[PDB]
């Protein structure tokens, strides 16, 4: 038998993820890059412990814009701090385009694949990470010959995975003609969770701190008026709401957005807002003196 290649999932430590985002957005739209320091263990886990950035160029990515001289100095800096392991590949950030390897990027990747076969290329989209999703996808070159022999099915053996394809168009061209994409899981520790979830010093300063009570009166005025308009609209609707076919009523007597529903959202927000506010006043007034 030969060597069989099979699924992997690239686990981007919490550290690694922030650095790529920080370095990549900051340098966008000029292309950003850097090496991924980490370790491969297992046969299903690429674990990227850290990344750093290699110096930007206005030739963007190139095979000779990788720059090994800078790589070597950087490696010795990690060596003296006892953090060097194994460079597990390279990442680069396309600006506002999708995750797909460019033709040039294929040859950049071909170089790192010689040095370690388990090397990945991680393509980042930073201007698209300001949604509620962070858009990052991973690729790893597969032998052109292997694709001829139908060895893309080989890469999904021994699990159902979480297989899904987040992007096509240039992606599915490059997969077909070069690569096997990887899904992305995140590693983080229980320490790191607590660091991430904590984002305020005002955690204990937000139910003793209050907003000006003129602002609250303005808010109650605004809220009550809004629901007064929605009630007139509702009242026009509910003069009927009694004939056959719901859908006919929704058109005819506007139940376009349902003024019942609309009033419920508005009612509930200001009602909940006032209970906190009164409770803050009453805590401070009685407790402090």
């Amino acid at each position: 038998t030969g060597r069989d290649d099979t699924k992997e999932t690239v686990y981007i430590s919490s550290i690694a993820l922030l650095k790529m985002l920080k370095h990549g957005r900051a340098g966008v739209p000029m292309e950003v890059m850097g090496l991924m320091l980490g370790e491969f263990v297992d046969d299903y886990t690429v674990n990227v412990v850290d990344v750093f950035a290699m110096p930007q160029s206005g030739t963007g990515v190139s095979v000779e814009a990788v720059d090994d001289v800078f790589q070597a100095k950087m490696m010795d800096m990690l060596k003296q701090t006892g953090r060097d392991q194994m460079v597990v590949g390279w990442y680069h950030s396309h600006p506002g385009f999708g995750c797909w390897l460019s033709s040039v990027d294929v040859n950049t990747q071909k170089s790192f694949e010689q040095l370690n076969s388990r090397a990945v290329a991680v393509v980042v989209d930073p201007i698209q990470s300001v949604k509620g999703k962070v858009v990052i996808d991973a690729f790893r070159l597969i032998d052109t010959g292997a694709l001829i022999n139908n060895l893309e099915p080989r890469q999904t053996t021994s699990n159902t995975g979480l297989l899904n394809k987040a992007n096509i168009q240039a992606l599915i061209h490059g997969l077909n003609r070069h690569y096997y994409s990887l899904n992305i899981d995140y590693h983080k520790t229980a320490k790191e969770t607590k660091m991430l979830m904590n984002l305020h010093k005002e955690q204990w300063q937000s139910g003793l701190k209050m907003y000006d009570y003129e602002e609250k009166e303005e808010s109650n005025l605004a809220a009550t008026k809004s629901m007064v308009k929605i009630a007139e609209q509702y009242s026009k609707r509910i003069e009927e709401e009694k004939e056959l076919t719901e859908e006919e009523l929704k058109t005819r007597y506007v139940g376009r957005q349902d003024p019942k529903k609309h009033l419920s959202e508005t009612a509930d927000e200001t009602l909940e807002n006032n209970i906190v506010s009164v409770l803050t006043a009453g805590v401070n007034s009685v407790a402090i003196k």
């Binding site: 340098g27 966008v28 739209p29 000029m30 292309e31 206005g58 963007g60």
Partner: protein
């Protein structure tokens, strides 16, 4: 100026650009026919040399006398 197209930074300064049609104005190493392969209409050759050619070379005698040079 050059601006870097990857990310807009004034990179360096470049000569001012004129159209290719305006860059067709200058000579190819234009053949001369001097005043001596133009026979006849002698008085015209003298009147042109006076108007155009000599106020360029002897602009010094124009400033000392204090005249201006013509505009075409």
């Amino acid at each position: 100026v050059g601006v870097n197209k990857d990310s807009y930074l004034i990179l360096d300064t470049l000569p001012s650009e004129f159209d290719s049609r305006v860059k067709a104005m200058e000579v190819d190493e234009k053949p001369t026919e001097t005043y001596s392969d133009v026979g006849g209409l002698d008085k015209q050759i003298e009147e042109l040399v006076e108007a155009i050619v000599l106020p360029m070379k002897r602009a010094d005698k124009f400033k000392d006398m204090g005249i201006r040079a013509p505009k075409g």
